[PDB]
Design a protein around this ligand. Sequence first.
Ligand code: HEC
Ligand code: HEC
Ligand code: HEC
Ligand code: HEC
Ligand SMILES: [Ca+2]
Ligand SMILES: [Ca+2]
Lengths: 324, 324
Amino acid sequence: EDVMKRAQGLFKPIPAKPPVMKDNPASPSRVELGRMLFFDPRLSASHLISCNTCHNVGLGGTDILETSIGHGWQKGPRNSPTVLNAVYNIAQFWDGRAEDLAAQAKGPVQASVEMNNKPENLVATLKSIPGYPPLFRKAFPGQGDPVTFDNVAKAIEVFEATLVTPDAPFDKYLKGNRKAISSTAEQGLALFLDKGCAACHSGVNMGGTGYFPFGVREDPGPVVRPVDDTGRYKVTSTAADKYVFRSPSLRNVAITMPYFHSGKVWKLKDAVKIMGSAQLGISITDADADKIVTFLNTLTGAQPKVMHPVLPPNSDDTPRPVSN
Amino acid sequence: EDVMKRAQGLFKPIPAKPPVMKDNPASPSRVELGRMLFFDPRLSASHLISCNTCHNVGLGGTDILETSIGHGWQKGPRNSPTVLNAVYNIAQFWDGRAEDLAAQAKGPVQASVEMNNKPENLVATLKSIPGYPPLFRKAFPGQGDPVTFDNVAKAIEVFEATLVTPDAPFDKYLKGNRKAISSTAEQGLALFLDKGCAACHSGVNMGGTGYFPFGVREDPGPVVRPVDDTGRYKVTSTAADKYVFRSPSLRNVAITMPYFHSGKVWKLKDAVKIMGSAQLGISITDADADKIVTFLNTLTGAQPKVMHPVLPPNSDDTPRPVSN
Ligand code: HEC
Ligand code: HEC
Ligand code: HEC
Ligand code: HEC
Ligand SMILES: [Ca+2]
Ligand SMILES: [Ca+2]
C-alpha cells in the first residue's frame, strides 16, 4: 500500500505486445524468419551452434553454465545473459557495446569462441538453401537481394522482440493485486527498496537501464570479478569506465543462474549478499537475503512457448560445415 | 498401375497413430516427459548437449554433419541417423546393437564422445530439479522412486514413437493416388524396383528391416567404407558379419544428407550410384540416378511440429556442469 505504491512509482510491468523497433517493422513474415534463424545451427561455421544453444528458450533464455562454450568447445570470458526481455534494455551485452538487438546479433555470428562464422560464409550458406531466399523476400520485400548479414540481424531482432515474459506475479502485483505476491515476497520488496537496490534495478525491466561499477563500495574479489575483465573500459578506453558493467534486468533472475558477468556465483542468495556488500557496503542478514530472494522469485514471467522451426533443407551447393 | 500395384505389394505408408511399445504404454504424461528429456541438455555431463543437438527436429531428425560432434568437440566414427520413424526399424543403430528405442537411449547418455554422462550423475541431476520428480510420478505412477535411468529411456522412447512422418507424397501414392507423385517420380520408382533396391529397402519404413554387407558386389573404398568400422562384426564377433550394417530407412532421405554410416557421400545422387555399384554390380546411368532421386524425394513426410519444452529450472543442489 505504502510499499505497493512506492513500487508502482519505480517499476513497470512487461507489456503484452512486443515493442516497435525503429527502422525495423515487424510482420508475421519477418518475425517468423528470425525464429527460424534463431534456431538454425547453420548460422555457425560448424553448423552445430544456434542462438538457442547459449540462449535456450527452454532454460530461461540462457545456457546455465558459468561461461558459454561454443566453437571448438572454447569457453568465453562471460556468462550468457537471457534474451528474454533483452529488448527492453538500453544497450546489449554486459558492457553495453551494442546499441540494440540487430547490432547485437552480428556479434555471436562472427565471434571465434561462439559461432566463429564470417558474413560472406553465412550469406553464401543461406542463399544455397532453397527455402531461405523466398522467406527473406516475404520478410524484406522490394529488395533485389534480401539475403544479407544485415537482414539476418533484423529478422532476429524482431523475433527477440516477441521474447518477453509478461504476467510475472510481481507484474500482477504492480497492476493492483496485493495478493499476487506473498506476504514474505512483499517484505522482500520492502527490503529491496529500503536497501537501495532499485537505484540500479528499476523501470520496466528491473535493471538494464545504466552502467555502474561492479564494486561501488568493496571489490568483490578476483573470482567474482576477474581482474582481466574491466567491463566498459575495453569499449571506451575511459579510466572512469574500469570495472563498470550494465546493471542486468532481474526479470527471470531465479531461473538464469549462475550470476554476474563472470558466472561464478551460483546461488541467487549469495548474489544478493554480494550486491549488498559490493554495491552498498552492507552485510545483508541471512533472513533478509532470504526475503529478497523470495521477492526476486516473483520476477519470473510466463516463458515463451516456442515451436521449434522445421528448417528448410540444404541443397547440394550448401557450404560444408567447418569444425576446426 | 502395373507399377503402383507392384509398389503396394512391397511398401506400406507410415500410420498416422504412434505404434504401441511393449512393456511401455504411452500416456500424455509419459510422452510429455520424454519430450522434455529429449530437449534437456542436462541429460549430458556438460549440460550443453541434448538429443536435439544431433537429431535436430528442425533438420530431419539429424545433425547434417559427416559424423556427430559431442562432448569436448569430439567427433564420433558415425553419421547420426534420423530419429524420425526410427521406431519402425527392427533394431537401433547402424549395427542394430540396440533392440529398441528404450535400449538405444541409454547409449548416447553414457557415450564419451556424445553426452559423456553416467547414470548416477544423470539421476542425481534429475532429482535435484524440483519440477522433474512430479513429472516422473505422472509418467510412472505407483513407483516409490520413478526417477531412474530406465524411466528416462522409457519416456524418451514413447516420445520418439510420436516422431513419425506420415503423408509423404509416396504414401499418398501407395494409398491409391497416382497423381500424388510426378510421372518422373513414378519412373524413378520403376527403376528402384527393377534394379533390385527394394530387396533391402522395403516395408513400412523403406528400409530398416535387415542386415547386409555394405559391398555385396564391390568394395565401396576406404573413404565411403572406413576399413576400421566393420559394422555388425564388432557386435557379434562372427566373420560373416564383417562390414554388415542395417539397411537404413530411406524415409526423409532427401533431407538427411550426408549419407552412409561414414557420412562421406553428400549427394543423394552419388549415394544412388554407389548403391548400384556396391550392392548390385551395376553402373546406374546419370539419367537413371536422377529419376531414382526424384522418386526418393517423394519419401519426405510431414515433419513433426514440436513445441520447444519450457524446462523446469535447477535448484541450488543441482550438480555442476562437467566440461572436461
Ligand atoms: C544467435 C545469433 C544469437 C543471438 C540472437 C544472441 N546470441 Fe548471445 N551471448 C553469449 C554471451 C557469453 C553473451 C554475453 C557477452 C558479453 O556481454 O560480452 C551473449 C550476449 C547476448 C545478448 C545480450 C543480452 C543482454 O542482456 O546483454 C543477446 C541479445 C544475445 N546474446 C543474443 C553467448 C552466445 C553463444 C555461446 C557460444 C552463442 C552461440 C550466442 N550467444 C548467439 C546468439
Ligand atoms: C540490493 C541489495 C541489490 C540486489 C538484491 C541486487 N542488486 Fe545489483 N547489480 C548491479 C550491476 C552493475 C550488476 C552486474 C554486475 C556484474 O555482474 O558485473 C548487478 C548484478 C546483480 C544481480 C545478478 C543478476 C544476474 O543476471 O547476474 C543481482 C541478483 C542483483 N544485482 C541484485 C548494479 C547494482 C547497483 C548500482 C550501483 C546497486 C545499488 C545494486 N546493484 C544493488 C542490488
Ligand atoms: C538423447 C538421449 C538421444 C536420443 C533419444 C537419440 N540420440 Fe543419437 N545417434 C548419434 C549417432 C552418431 C548415432 C549413430 C550411432 C551408431 O549407429 O553407432 C545415433 C543413433 C541414434 C539412434 C538410432 C537410429 C537408427 O535409425 O539407427 C537413435 C534412435 C538415437 N540416436 C536417438 C549421435 C548422437 C549424439 C551426438 C553427439 C547425441 C547427443 C545423441 N545421439 C543423443 C541421442
Ligand atoms: C538400388 C539401386 C538402391 C538404392 C537407390 C539405394 N539402395 Fe541401399 N543400402 C543398403 C545398406 C546396408 C545401406 C547402409 C550402408 C552403409 O552406410 O553402411 C544402404 C544405404 C543406402 C542409402 C543411404 C541412406 C542413408 O541414410 O545414408 C541410399 C540412398 C540407398 N541405400 C539407396 C542395402 C542395400 C541392398 C542390400 C543388399 C541393396 C540391393 C541396396 N541397398 C540397393 C539400393
Ligand atoms: Ca546468469
Ligand atoms: Ca545422413
